[PDB]
């Protein structure tokens, strides 16, 4: 019984590192926009910079 | 007088009884300890396959 009961405990830690690998890579998708996101703000922040330069415009 | 001999002869005789009834039972109590380590034997093998798996 103690071996049925370490094999499951086994079998569930697979289960668990299962998880934990594709969490991991779930996060790595939902990293990646976030930080083409904040490209899109690092960019604008660059342009608004320009809008000041332009003092008749701006 | 004669008695005390007679009942002498059965006291010791039923003090061995009683000790080689506890020497048997002692090694009955041995006997399954060391049939419980030939089965700790295979939990060892079967722990040795878990660490495997």
């Keep these: 019984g103690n071996f049925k009961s370490k094999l499951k405990k086994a079998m569930l830690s697979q289960q668990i590192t299962k998880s934990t690998i ?3 890579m ?3 998708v939902l ?8 490209g899109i703000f690092e960019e604008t922040k660059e342009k608004l910079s ?3 330069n332009n003092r008749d415009e701006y | 007088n004669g008695i005390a001999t007679l009942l002498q002869a059965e006291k010791e005789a039923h003090e061995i009884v009683s000790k080689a ?4 039972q002692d090694k009955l109590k041995q006997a ?10 295979y939990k060892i093998q079967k722990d040795k396959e878990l660490k495997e798996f």
């Design chain 1, 26 to 28: 779930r996060l790595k």
């Design chain 2, 21 to 24: 009834r506890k020497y048997r």
């Design chain 2, 32 to 41: 399954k300890t060391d049939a419980a380590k030939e089965i700790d034997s």
């Design chain 1, 31 to 38: 990293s990646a926009r976030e930080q083409s996101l904040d």
């Design chain 1, 22 to 24: 594709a969490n991991k």
């Design chain 1, 50 to 52: 320009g809008i000041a």
